[PDB]
Amino acid sequence: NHADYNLNSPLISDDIDNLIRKFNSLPIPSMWDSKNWDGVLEMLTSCQANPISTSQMHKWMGSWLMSDNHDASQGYSFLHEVDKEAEITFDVVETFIRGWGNKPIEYIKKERWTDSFKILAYLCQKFLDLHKLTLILNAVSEVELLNLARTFKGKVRRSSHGTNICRIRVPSLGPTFISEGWAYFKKLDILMDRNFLLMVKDVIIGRMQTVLSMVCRIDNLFSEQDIFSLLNIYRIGDKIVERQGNFSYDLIKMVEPICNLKLMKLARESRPLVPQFPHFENHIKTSVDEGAKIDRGIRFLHDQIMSVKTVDLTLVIYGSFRHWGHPFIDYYTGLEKLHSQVTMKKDIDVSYAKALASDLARIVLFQQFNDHKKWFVNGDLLPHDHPFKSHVKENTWPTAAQVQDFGDKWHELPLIKCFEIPDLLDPSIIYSDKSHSMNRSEVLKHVRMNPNTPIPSKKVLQTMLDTKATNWKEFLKEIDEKGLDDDDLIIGLKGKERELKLAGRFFSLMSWKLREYFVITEYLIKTHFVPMFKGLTMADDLTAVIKKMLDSSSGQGLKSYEAICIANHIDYEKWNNHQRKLSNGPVFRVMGQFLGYPSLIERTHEFFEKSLIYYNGRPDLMRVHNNTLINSTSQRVCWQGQEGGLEGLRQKGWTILNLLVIQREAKIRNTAVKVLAQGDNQVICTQYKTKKSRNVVELQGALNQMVSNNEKIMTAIKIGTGKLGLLINDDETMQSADYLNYGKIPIFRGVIRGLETKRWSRVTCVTNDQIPTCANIMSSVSTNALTVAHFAENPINAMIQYNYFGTFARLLLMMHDPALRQSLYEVQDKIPGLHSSTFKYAMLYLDPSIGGVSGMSLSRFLIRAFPDPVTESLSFWRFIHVHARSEHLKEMSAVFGNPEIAKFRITHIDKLVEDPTSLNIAMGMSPANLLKTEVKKCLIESRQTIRNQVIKDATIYLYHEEDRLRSFLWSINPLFPRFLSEFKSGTFLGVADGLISLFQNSRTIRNSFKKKYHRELDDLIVRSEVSSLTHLGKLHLRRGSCKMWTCSATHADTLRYKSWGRTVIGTTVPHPLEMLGPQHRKETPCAPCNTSGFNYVSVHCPDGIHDVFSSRGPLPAYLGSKTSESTSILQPWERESKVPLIKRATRLRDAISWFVEPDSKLAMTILSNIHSLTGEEWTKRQHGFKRTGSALHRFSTSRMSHGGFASQSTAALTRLMATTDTMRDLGDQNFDFLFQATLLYAQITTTVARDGWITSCTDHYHIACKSCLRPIEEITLDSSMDYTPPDVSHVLKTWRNGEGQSYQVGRCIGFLYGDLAYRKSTHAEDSSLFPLSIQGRIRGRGFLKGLLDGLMRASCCQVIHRRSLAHLKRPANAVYGGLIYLIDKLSVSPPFLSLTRSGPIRDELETIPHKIPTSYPTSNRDMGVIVRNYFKYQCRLIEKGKYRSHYSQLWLFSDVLSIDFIGPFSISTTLLQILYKPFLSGKDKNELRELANLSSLLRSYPPWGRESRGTITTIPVYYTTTPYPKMLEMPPRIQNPLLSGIRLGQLPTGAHYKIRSILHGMGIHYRDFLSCGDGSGGMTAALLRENVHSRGIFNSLLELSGSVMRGASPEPPSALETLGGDKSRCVNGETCWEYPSDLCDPRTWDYFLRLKAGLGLQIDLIVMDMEVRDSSTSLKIETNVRNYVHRILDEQGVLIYKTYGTYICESEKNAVTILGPMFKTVDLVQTEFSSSQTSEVYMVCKPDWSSINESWKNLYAFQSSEQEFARAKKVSTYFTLTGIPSQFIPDPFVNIETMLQIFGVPTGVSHAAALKSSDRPADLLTISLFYMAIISYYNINHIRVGPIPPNPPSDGIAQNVGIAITGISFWLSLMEKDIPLYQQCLAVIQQSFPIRWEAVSVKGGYKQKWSTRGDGLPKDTRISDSLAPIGNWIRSLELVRNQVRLNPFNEILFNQLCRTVDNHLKWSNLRRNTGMIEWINRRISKEDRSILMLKSDLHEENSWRD
Ligand SMILES: [Zn+2]
Ligand SMILES: [Zn+2]
């Protein structure tokens, strides 16, 4: 009403002190005798006591906290009350949770832990009586005083000057005396003001709410001992601030980093082997040493903290740190420190900064030129370098060559406009209520004139109204050219309040021109340049940020060191001080060049250097001369000149400078540098990843190498940043792959965590001046609770705490509510019954949208946003009713969700047009809208006062034509409030709206003093509150209203209908709760839950949600909807920043046809006319724009159109998989429900209702409400009142701006993706899933051929730009090349890739022969393969002949807006016909030049057979009673890619043949089987095809993490493509994943036996290929079979168990474990890989050990390379391919072409090769060696000349050339018969394929050399994971050999091939110079493991939307 509860402004004890002065003897204050203090002096004399003053204040403060000698009572009673109320309200939540997540809860009291409750009772005693003192000393009215006096037992005492001294007795401190703003005295003899008292209230209530929040949770994360430990921490903290006064906060400023350091230490304990970084801990230790040199016990503090054993408790402490906090600021020392840190003279390297500036210019030139493909430089330049050629051509845009050539002069050019200055109309985009200083003459005159009084800050809005507006154009123009005038350069300082630094570090406020300057330039920055930089999270809302928080790939103790992201975070000193001109100048010069006005934005440090600085808190001390303030008294309280700094100015700008330094110094090592820059404070994620560590000392060394690399980066950054004059510290920190800290938000391991302590330590705090009301405190507990919910895991602790802190608050306001000025117990007579179940529930539970007060629904913890408050809560209430196990809850459901509707008025519709979705209620008069009404009213009733023409004309327009718009809008019968609102905003009235709204509540009541309105607003507040509470008392009608709806969405509609006159467009969305209802658990039957059909969402949690925050989690994510919102993470101004007016009008014209059509012409001529009033009439009309889209969620103006966001931790959402693709069957009309919200809801509800489960799980959601599932329509409104936009605003427009068949789908999305992929921005869902709102049916080869078309065109266009015109050689190669690049880029790109996983497109990709995948769900890898493969097939057909586009009717679609497609598409048909046609040159060059200029100016059962059947090496075995145990040779292990390669016709794997060999020789007849442990279903497919009449049970460990399923189910096992798409014979096909697919445990067996008794299978056969990695898991599964076997397996039945030789000789024989009637084991070659211990155990079910030993000697691992090799020859002799149909095999060239293309060569070469392979089957060897050559020369270049070719072994290229050499030389050795190749091969694959590196100088720069037999630099390559591609090699070349013979290696031919395909290089250059001839018989012994010296790239961490 007047002043503030909780804390606003800093401490500054000087006030108190000088009052002690004036009081005491008159030691004299300074100048403040002016003050009215004599009231307090009358208190001081009338009650004589004596103060203590400051340091002592903080002493007794420390003492007084946590004290026992005290009273208690009110504490006990209060808390018990809270307890009771909360029990009731928890009745409500009880039924909610329990009906929602099936888990029931009991209300745990807070009395349970005893001592905790005692502690908390003392704190409550203290807080509650501090709440009283708060209340009293902040009240103006004698009435409030008398009511509080009667309520709180105190009394009024009038003092002689007419000053009321209240006297109060309170149980903590005993007696107290209180007067205007001043307090206390006797008992503890102390004086205090509002500021000090309140910060103490903040303290105690912090401790209170934190202890409260933790003490009893549902999860027990705490015990009274832990709490005892935190309490101890408070005790210690106290003891510090006890021992001395304010100085302790040094040591506290130490507390929060000590906390940081314990955190780091834990998250380091995570993956133990990493070196710690001594830096930070050491620094800390030193700070504790010095701290303990002053005062110890900080020692004990630090110690006990780091003694804390938990994550949580630590995080709490770090969550507090501010407790026992907030010391007095000394602004003197503050200003000294500041001014010095400014004055500091900095060494600056200039040309360094200039090089940065250049780097930037390069950046945005690239971006712009990759956007509009129009170089933005002038053609005025020197006819040289790149530029002339460049801009003239419209692309020279150069290469590495011309970039190296070009110095970094990018900052020197003639740079043009580029970014256009957005129109700022309405204040929203500029102004907030922050203040600013008055001009120079005036401040100076307010120092000369009344001195003693601090000079005020002129509120931005008050000056916005009273001063003539800004001409943005002339402003910037004149600032640019001549700069600002002296009288506008002034900066005021205010000590910001919370800092905890004894320094105080003053926040700044400018003068009006400086204000506007910094704002508009800041806004140009953020709008244009901010986005050109990754990292720098400013514009980011939340979801985006969290994505940027998952730009830390941290965590993973699971995978351990196989990938790591180190994390640096840096703080500087004063970033916002040490900023300097001579550094910042060039870059901001560049930025200036860019935004229209050169040398504009560079004037920052100039305006600082010229300006005045002063601290408006002490004007007395400043003296006036020469338009200068001088310090006089020598405190440095003001000064002239500055070298820059002061906080929030060019935050973004200086941050872009730094971030550029980083991106420049990132280049040094190519290390992966990810960055997050929040203003000052920044973090650098440094990514590395490892290749499969072996000896564990490698981890030590390698990780220490990651550290070394890291420290190098940091050092380069230190020096670099240092050159600019920014001091970086060696005490500023970093952590390992774990932790990270960003803007005080912790990420721990791989996961975000909030400070529940902090949010709950806020609670009852009310924001500035707002004061607590029924609405406000509830609003606070609410928002903070939803925050907690949002950051934590399953949002429950937030719900129960909500209930608690809510009813805590409610009892506080029941005690007294400052709004009603008296207690609410006392008020019963006035207003209806406040004390009821009704009122309680209402106050804390019904939403405002149903029309009651406030406090959520408990439905909002679910979807973070969602656009239907009404439906949401009404749905909630129906739901709590239906699951209510009581009566009065039902009573409350009817009561609540039948809101009494007030009778319609055009007034109300004005309100609920201004905001949509809501309803007309018998209350709802908010202080908000009432104050909006009042400020509208006042602002309107003075339109003649306003000195601003923008605002004047806006107010006029309002006062005149608002009615016209009102009625005109209101007459549209299909009532479309979204459109009425967007139009309403988009009309020139958007100004009126912006400003009227712009005033924030408290700031408004502060700014409403502008006029006669003083009392009205206060009694209006009283009006609103009495009415509110009156509405609840009224809401005790119980049961009086109607009943339980049916599916409240339809009823929310009907209620909206009854609310208004008519029905509404249907903008209401049934929300997930009522429609999807509780979850069906598929682990249970769910069979009645089956609707058949797909009315079914599902979610998977493999491994389950059990323990989270403890690891990152495997699965990718799901964040939410796409479009952003208002940022709630910070508080600068930013809410309405989005979407100015011209853009609005433009966009609702970009609506038109959608829901209106031009045919309507009325609303339309109107729309265009709005666009004509804002602008002029630029309308060309529009036609053919028909849009079929949904009208509820989607329609908006560029703003949030969204469906919702996840309110949940990333944690569970990382352990889950949401699946959508199951629902394709609701395609229907493409109607209401939000897939976004639904998916989100499934996620949360799943997490909540699982809450921990380790057995994994699968969950079903089937639509319960088919009725309010609600099919849509498309209504196109028109109506009319015959309205026209009046009052032409072109005056304003002057002053405002500164002049700102499916082949068709294929071509559309494919060209769109080509072009967009070249622009490099948004890949999101524009490649969508299956028939869209664009409709369709067939999506075939039609879709794909078209895709190739549109895409090819897109590459046509990008290739006219991409290349120099005057070089035309073979344009075919140009365009072909571009499209190749695109295709690869697309096969990597995921959304399209899942799109091709699922659906009928798979077919068109399964028609072409490829190869089967292996990965069960088929990873992005195998998908990329298949996609590429098919495309190389079709594109091959292109590279040969001509490309026809068929069709040629360009069907543009509704999903393509404007010309981003149109122009280039037309131009691309012509351009394909021009460019791909000739294979030549002509006049076309002219045409290219022309058209490219126009573009840049335009943007102004399958057949089958027999198969390989092998030999069985048999081991019969018996077990008779007694053992003869253990004596056995344990085999060796060779990995021998050999035979794994010789298997030729392999489907996903040749285990296929193995099983054939079993069921061949071992003689099984199985009618039906169970195949478990198949990856893609290989052995399944095998069995199933082999015995055609068999049925089978498929089981696969579901390998998820390696693939991103974007809204899709993992799909069938790929292998079952084998059966020709008819999998019907495999019963478990297509459903496989949704059961317990885990074989490690039981329940899977219960499920199989289910499937046995279910389909009557009888399961003759069991087969398990485990591929066992764990003895544990093995013994586990052994026990499983041991249990379930002979109750599942049949009576003649069979069990095959694949076993490992080492593992069976190892310890616990599974052979022993399982012994049935006939028992054996076998080895089967003519299948099995060479030198292999692996063997198939066997049981037919229904001495010996020495024979076992014998057989083990007859086993393969034992046997040697002659057995190995000769056996593989035998296999070579077998026809391994045979009955395989061609669909399955690769094309026995295309695999070669693509492989050589996998190994880095050009496709042309690949193809010439593959041809030569085709042509020369006879002489193969020559061609093979030629592959060796070609891969070698294109990888490592044994020949060429160049200037400095550094280390091009560089890991990978060397890797793939090594493996190439291996596979090749393998099958070569097998052909050419040479053993020592083979021996070598084995020893190599085992260890270290040599690559010995050199660079020799023959001049011309220098040549490069690689070898083996020599020793250079050894990049020697390990191969472990590499058998697979070796296999590919052997397979391919065995596959092209086609059983055909071979002929001698023909050296002549080799030469032919070599010089043909390559430079002229020869067998010679290969022979000696550098090469692989070593692979004749020659090599060297092992040297390096150093590919295990790892590398760096970037990390792939996927979430969906932003
Ligand atoms: Zn429903
Ligand atoms: Zn189901």
Q: Relative to the alpha carbon of 1097, which ligand is closest?
A: 2
Task: Specify whether the CB–CB gap between 684 and 718 falls below 8 A.
Answer: no
Length of the chain: 2002
The answer to whether residue 1149 sits within a structural domain is: no
Query: How many angstroms does the Cα of residue 1047 sit away from the middle of ligand 1?
Result: 4
Q: What is the rounded distance in angstroms from the CA atom of residue 1243 to the CA atom of residue 1647? A: 25
| Nearest 10 degrees: Cα torsion 1812, 1817, 1819, 1824 | 60
Q: What angle do CA 905, 908, 914 make, to 5 degrees?
A: 140
Tokens of 1119: 């964040």
Residues 6+ apart with CB under 8 A from 1596: 1416, 1572, 1573, 1574, 1575, 1576, 1577, 1613, 1632, 1637
Task: Specify whether the CB–CB gap between 1866 and 1878 falls below 8 A.
Answer: yes
Count Cα neighbours of 378 within 13 Å in the Cβ-side half-sphere. 11
The answer to whether residue 4 sits within a structural domain is: yes
The answer to whether residue 250 sits within a structural domain is: no
Query: How many angstroms does the Cα of residue 1248 sit away from the middle of ligand 1?
Result: 22
Query: Same domain for 1710 and 1842?
Result: no
Query: How many angstroms does the Cα of residue 1094 sit away from the middle of ligand 2?
Result: 9
571 annotated ligand binder: yes
Task: Specify whether the CB–CB gap between 629 and 641 falls below 8 A.
Answer: no
- Residue identified by tokens 């939803």 is 786
Residues 6+ apart with CB under 8 A from 1728: 1539, 1554, 1734, 1756
Tokens of 1408: 């072409």
Query: How many angstroms does the Cα of residue 860 sit away from the middle of ligand 1?
Result: 17
1086 annotated ligand binder: yes
- Of residues 179, 166, 64, 168, the one with CA closest to residue 122: 64
172 annotated ligand binder: no
Q: Which of 1736, 1787, 1793, 1984 is catalytic?
A: 1736
- Strand pairing report for 490-494 and 612-615: parallel
Tokens of 667: 């280049």
The answer to whether residue 757 sits within a structural domain is: no
1101 annotated ligand binder: no
Tokens of 120: 């908390």
Query: How many angstroms does the Cα of residue 1420 sit away from the middle of ligand 2?
Result: 28
Task: Specify whether the CB–CB gap between 1284 and 1324 falls below 8 A.
Answer: no
Residues 6+ apart with CB under 8 A from 1813: 1789, 1792, 1820, 1823, 1936
**Across the strands, what pairs with 175?**
169
Query: How many angstroms does the Cα of residue 1093 sit away from the middle of ligand 2?
Result: 10
1357 annotated ligand binder: no
Task: State whether the Cα torsion 1998-1999-2001-2002 is positive or negative.
Answer: negative
Q: What is the rounded distance in angstroms from the CA atom of residue 869 to the CA atom of residue 919? A: 10
Query: How many angstroms does the Cα of residue 1337 sit away from the middle of ligand 2?
Result: 27
Query: Same domain for 1378 and 1483?
Result: yes
**Beta-carbon neighbour count of residue 1046 at 10 Å?**
12
Left, alpha or beta for 1161 (phi > 0: left; psi -120 to 50: alpha)?
Answer: left
- Strand pairing report for 628-630 and 745-748: unpaired
Q: Relative to the alpha carbon of 1052, which ligand is closest?
A: 1
Q: Which of 302, 1100, 1193, 1293 is catalytic?
A: 1193
Q: What is the rounded distance in angstroms from the CA atom of residue 730 to the CA atom of residue 752? A: 26
Tell me whether residue 1177 is one of the annotated catalytic residues: no
Residues 6+ apart with CB under 8 A from 1204: 863, 864, 865, 866, 867, 1120, 1121, 1234, 1236, 1237, 1240
Query: How many angstroms does the Cα of residue 875 sit away from the middle of ligand 1?
Result: 8
Query: Same domain for 70 and 158?
Result: yes
- For residue 1228, give the 3-state DSSP assignment: coil
- For residue 707, give the 3-state DSSP assignment: helix
**Across the strands, what pairs with 1213?**
none
Residues 6+ apart with CB under 8 A from 24: none
1579 annotated ligand binder: yes
Query: How many angstroms does the Cα of residue 1075 sit away from the middle of ligand 1?
Result: 4
- Of residues 187, 575, 586, the one with CA closest to residue 358: 586
1047 annotated ligand binder: yes
Task: Specify whether the CB–CB gap between 1649 and 1684 falls below 8 A.
Answer: yes
Output DSSP code: residue 252: H
The answer to whether residue 978 sits within a structural domain is: no
Task: Specify whether the CB–CB gap between 1327 and 1310 falls below 8 A.
Answer: no
Q: Relative to the alpha carbon of 1049, which ligand is closest?
A: 1
Q: Please list the alpha-helical segments (H only) found in 382-471.
A: 387-393, 400-405, 440-448, 460-466
Residues 6+ apart with CB under 8 A from 744: none
Tell me whether residue 1665 is one of the annotated catalytic residues: yes
Domain end, chosen from 699, 731, 763, is at 731
Q: How far is CA 1702 from the centre of its chain?
A: 46
Q: What is the rounded distance in angstroms from the CA atom of residue 1311 to the CA atom of residue 209? A: 58
Query: How many angstroms does the Cα of residue 1424 sit away from the middle of ligand 1?
Result: 41
Query: Same domain for 1876 and 1938?
Result: yes
Query: How many angstroms does the Cα of residue 1269 sit away from the middle of ligand 1?
Result: 6
Q: Please list the alpha-helical segments (H only) found in 321-350.
A: 331-343
Residues 6+ apart with CB under 8 A from 945: 465, 1011
Q: Which of 881, 1698, 1720, 1812 is catalytic?
A: 1698
Task: Specify whether the CB–CB gap between 575 and 563 falls below 8 A.
Answer: no
Q: How far is CA 858 from the centre of its chain?
A: 25
Query: How many angstroms does the Cα of residue 1090 sit away from the middle of ligand 2?
Result: 5
Q: What is the rounded distance in angstroms from the CA atom of residue 757 to the CA atom of residue 208? A: 10
The answer to whether residue 1225 sits within a structural domain is: yes
Left, alpha or beta for 1850 (phi > 0: left; psi -120 to 50: alpha)?
Answer: left
- Of residues 1285, 1321, 1271, 1410, the one with CA closest to residue 1785: 1410
User: Which strands form 672-678's sheet, in the order they lie side by side?
Assistant: 672-678, 681-689, 563-570, 734-735
b/e 1901-1940 (16+ beta carbons within 10 angstroms → b): ebbbbbbbeeebebbbbbbeebbebbbbbbbbbbbbbeee
Write out the residue range of the structural domain in which residue 1384 sits: 1303-1343+1364-1498
Q: What angle do CA 372, 374, 375 make, to 5 degrees?
A: 135
1573 annotated ligand binder: yes
C-alpha radius of gyration, the chain, whole number: 39
Q: What is the rounded distance in angstroms from the CA atom of residue 993 to the CA atom of residue 979? A: 16
Domain end, chosen from 220, 243, 259, is at 220
Distances (CA, A) of 1038 to 324, 830, 887, 940: 47, 20, 11, 43
Q: Relative to the alpha carbon of 1087, which ligand is closest?
A: 2
- For residue 1715, give the 3-state DSSP assignment: coil
Left, alpha or beta for 1420 (phi > 0: left; psi -120 to 50: alpha)?
Answer: alpha
Q: After which residue numbers is the chain interrupted with C–N beyond 2.5 angstroms?
A: 1300, 1500, 1742
Query: How many angstroms does the Cα of residue 1786 sit away from the middle of ligand 1?
Result: 52
Query: How many angstroms does the Cα of residue 582 sit away from the middle of ligand 2?
Result: 68
Q: Which of 1554, 1560, 1652, 1995 is catalytic?
A: 1554
Greatest CA separation for the chain: 122
1577 annotated ligand binder: yes
Query: Same domain for 1426 and 1527?
Result: no
Backbone angles phi, psi at 1718, to 5 degrees: -130, 110
Output DSSP code: residue 168: E
Domain end, chosen from 1444, 1464, 1498, is at 1498
291 annotated ligand binder: no
- For residue 1772, give the 3-state DSSP assignment: helix
Q: Which amino acid does the sequence have at 543? A: T
The answer to whether residue 879 sits within a structural domain is: no
Instruction: State the CATH number of the domain containing residue 1645.
Output: 3.40.50.150
- Strand pairing report for 1661-1664 and 1694-1699: parallel
1571 annotated ligand binder: yes
Tokens of 687: 């990514």
- Of residues 600, 702, 610, 706, the one with CA closest to residue 653: 600
Query: Same domain for 1480 and 1517?
Result: no
782 annotated ligand binder: no
Q: How far is CA 1899 from the centre of its chain?
A: 51
Q: Relative to the alpha carbon of 1050, which ligand is closest?
A: 1
Tokens of 280: 């930070």
Q: Classify residue 1097 by burial, with Cβ atoms within 10 Å: 0-12, 13-18, 19+.
A: buried
Query: Same domain for 30 and 109?
Result: yes
Helix (H) or strand (E) holding 1258: strand 1257-1261
Task: Specify whether the CB–CB gap between 507 and 496 falls below 8 A.
Answer: yes
Domain count for the chain, please give it: 6
Angle between helix 990-998 and helix 927-941 axes, rounded to 10 deg: 120
- For residue 310, give the 3-state DSSP assignment: coil
Count Cα neighbours of 594 within 13 Å in the Cβ-side half-sphere. 28
Query: How many angstroms does the Cα of residue 1607 sit away from the middle of ligand 2?
Result: 18
Q: Please list the alpha-helical segments (H only) found in 1389-1458.
A: 1390-1397, 1401-1407, 1420-1440
Q: Where are the beta strands (DSSP E) in 642-744?
A: 672-678, 681-689, 734-735, 740-742
Q: Relative to the alpha carbon of 1262, which ligand is closest?
A: 2
Q: Relative to the alpha carbon of 1270, which ligand is closest?
A: 1
Count Cα neighbours of 1058 within 13 Å in the Cβ-side half-sphere. 12
Tokens of 691: 């290749």
**Which residues have their alpha-adjacent CB atom under 5 A from ion ligand 2?**
1086, 1089, 1260
Count Cα neighbours of 1455 within 13 Å in the Cβ-side half-sphere. 15
Tokens of 1043: 């009943």
* Resolution to one decimal, Å: 3.8
Output DSSP code: residue 1188: -
Query: How many angstroms does the Cα of residue 1260 sit away from the middle of ligand 2?
Result: 5
Distances (CA, A) of 1710 to 1714, 1749, 1901: 6, 16, 65
Query: Same domain for 577 and 680?
Result: yes
- For residue 356, give the 3-state DSSP assignment: helix
Query: How many angstroms does the Cα of residue 1074 sit away from the middle of ligand 1?
Result: 5
- Of residues 1583, 978, 957, the one with CA closest to residue 1292: 957
Q: Please list the alpha-helical segments (H only) found in 1758-1851.
A: 1761-1773, 1790-1798, 1803-1815, 1821-1836
1572 annotated ligand binder: yes
Distances (CA, A) of 342 to 35, 337, 658, 709, 1802: 35, 9, 18, 34, 58
Q: Which of 480, 738, 1617, 1665 is catalytic?
A: 1665
**DSSP state letters, 1168-1182:** HHHHHHHS-------
Task: Specify whether the CB–CB gap between 852 and 923 falls below 8 A.
Answer: yes
Task: Specify whether the CB–CB gap between 873 and 881 falls below 8 A.
Answer: no
Distances (CA, A) of 112 to 103, 124, 217: 22, 17, 12
**Beta-carbon neighbour count of residue 409 at 10 Å?**
14
- For residue 15, give the 3-state DSSP assignment: helix
Q: Relative to the alpha carbon of 1232, which ligand is closest?
A: 1
Query: Same domain for 1473 and 1532?
Result: no
The answer to whether residue 1700 sits within a structural domain is: yes
Query: How many angstroms does the Cα of residue 1081 sit away from the middle of ligand 2?
Result: 8
| Nearest 10 degrees: Cα torsion 541, 547, 548, 549 | 110
1262 annotated ligand binder: yes
Query: Same domain for 19 and 71?
Result: yes
466 annotated ligand binder: no
Tell me whether residue 1698 is one of the annotated catalytic residues: yes
Helix (H) or strand (E) holding 1029: helix 1015-1035
Query: How many angstroms does the Cα of residue 1218 sit away from the middle of ligand 2?
Result: 15
- Of residues 967, 1033, 41, 1112, the one with CA closest to residue 558: 1112
Task: Specify whether the CB–CB gap between 142 and 165 falls below 8 A.
Answer: no
Query: Same domain for 1466 and 1540?
Result: no
Task: Specify whether the CB–CB gap between 372 and 1499 falls below 8 A.
Answer: yes
Q: Please list the alpha-helical segments (H only) found in 138-218.
A: 142-151, 194-215
Q: What is the rounded distance in angstroms from the CA atom of residue 1575 to the CA atom of residue 1614? A: 9
Q: Relative to the alpha carbon of 1258, which ligand is closest?
A: 2
Q: Relative to the alpha carbon of 1071, which ligand is closest?
A: 1
Residues 6+ apart with CB under 8 A from 303: none
Query: Same domain for 1483 and 1539?
Result: no
Helix (H) or strand (E) holding 1677: helix 1671-1684
